[PDB]
Amino acid sequence: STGSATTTPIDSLDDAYITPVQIGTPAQTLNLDFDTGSSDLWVFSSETTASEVDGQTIYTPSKSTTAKLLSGATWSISYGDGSSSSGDVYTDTVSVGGLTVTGQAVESAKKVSSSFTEDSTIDGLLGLAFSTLNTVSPTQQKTFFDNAKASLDSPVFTADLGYHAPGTYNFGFIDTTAYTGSITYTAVSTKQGFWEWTSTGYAVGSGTFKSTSIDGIADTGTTLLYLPATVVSAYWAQVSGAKSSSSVGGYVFPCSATLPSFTFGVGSARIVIPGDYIDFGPISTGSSSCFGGIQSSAGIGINIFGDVALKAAFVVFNGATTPTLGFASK
Numbered sequence: 130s131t132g133s134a135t136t137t138p139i140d141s142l143d144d145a146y147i148t149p150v151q152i153g154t155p156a157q158t159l160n161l162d163f164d165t166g167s168s169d170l171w172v173f174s175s176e177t178t179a180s181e182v183d184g185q186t187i188y189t190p191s192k193s194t195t196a197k198l199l200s201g202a203t204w205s206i207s208y209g210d211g212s213s214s215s216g217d218v219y220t221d222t223v224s225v226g227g228l229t230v231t232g233q234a235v236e237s238a239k240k241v242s243s244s245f246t247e248d249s250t251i252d253g254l255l256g257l258a259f260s261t262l263n264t265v266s267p268t269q270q271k272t273f274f275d276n277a278k279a280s281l282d283s284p285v286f287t288a289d290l291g292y293h294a295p296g297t298y299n300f301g302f303i304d305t306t307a308y309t310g311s312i313t314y315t316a317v318s319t320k321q322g323f324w325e326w327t328s329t330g331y332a333v334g335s336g337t338f339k340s341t342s343i344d345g346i347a348d349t350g351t352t353l354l355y356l357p358a359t360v361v362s363a364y365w366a367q368v369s370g371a372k373s374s375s376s377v378g379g380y381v382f383p384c385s386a387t388l389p390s391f392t393f394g395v396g397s398a399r400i401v402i403p404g405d406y407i408d409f410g411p412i413s414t415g416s417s418s419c420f421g422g423i424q425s426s427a428g429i430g431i432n433i434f435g436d437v438a439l440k441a442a443f444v445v446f447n448g449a450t451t452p453t454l455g456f457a458s459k
């Protein structure tokens with residue numbers, strides 16, 4: 130079986146992308162944030178504190194005849210952004226783009242963070258990291274991908290984010306129609322449960338490529354590109370006016386300024402993010418400072434290949450036994 134669904138950004142800066150998902154019987158469609166750096170399927174619901182639901186579509190486990198309590202089961206997550214979600218757990222049929230997974234663990238929030246509450250467009254998250262990270266206790270659960278896998282034609286899913294536009298999530302197959310040239314597969318370390326890979330270097334605009342191993346995760350759940358202090362300085366050094374700021378907490382640039390492109394190496398191949406991808410617009414409305422898309426990783430612990438970077442390539446998450454990450458130009 131395969132499934133394809135349309136992902137659409139939720140705002141003009143493509144701060145995140147949202148995918149329609151059918152949960153329940155009959156079907157309740159929620160828009161979830163597909164998160165390849167998290168292992169939890171969670172959604173706003175019928176139990177969620179009514180002080181923390183503001184415009185989101187809710188999943189009503191009451192109205193699904195396929196829905197049952199996982200009695201005793203419970204979840205809690207912390208995100209890198211400082212996001213916090215928690216509640217009870219149910220088992221339900223979940224369909225994504227016609228790929229139906231029966232008996233999927235759907236994590237019903239009782240409690241959600243400010244961050245999620247101030248976010249009207251997103252109805253929950255669908256984790257597509259490795260199952261080791263799934264939060265649910267006392268009996269830990271598998272992801273939707275983990276559930277789909279053997280049912281799939283191929284144990285893979287592709288990610289094809291658009292820049293100011295829809296893109297696509299495909300499960301079970303590779304559209305040879307969606308990229309240009311060759312896909313370069315690179316080795317994945319599963320050990321921390323991430324889609325965890327090592328980049329072969331970087332170039333700043335038309336400058337000379339530096340060969341240097343940047344260990345990082347592909348995470349479609351992270352908006353920007355997070356890279357070592359060193360790498361980040363070399364980039365912003367090329368934009369007049371760019372400064373790192375105490376108060377704003379990150380690199381900014383005069384919005385009148387011009388972003389050189391950024392190039393990252395996947396093996397022998399190279400991926401250009403156009404400079405336009407790294408403009409995240411003014412820090413506050415009216416401001417002539419604009420916020421950059423490539424930020425230091427120094428304060429997080431890990432380099433994140435976020436949307437900024439992934440949305441410049443056609444990515445393939447090979448969920449094989451010997452998991453492999455594929456990148457191609459599009």
Ligand SMILES: CC[C@H](C)[C@H](NC(=O)[C@@H](NC[C@H](O)[C@@H](N)CC(C)C)C(C)C)C(=O)N[C@@H](Cc1ccccc1)C(=O)OC
Nearest residue numbers: 162164166167206207208209210212262264348350351429
């Ligand atoms: C179930 C745990 C998952 C794996 C959780 N994952 C994450 O935080 C990863 N991304 C989290 C999400 O992709 C988030 N950026 C998307 C939005 C919509 C919520 C980071 C590491 C790249 C994590 O490691 N959380 C850390 C907290 C943390 C992580 C990174 C940096 C700082 C602090 C924890 O404590 O485990 C609960």
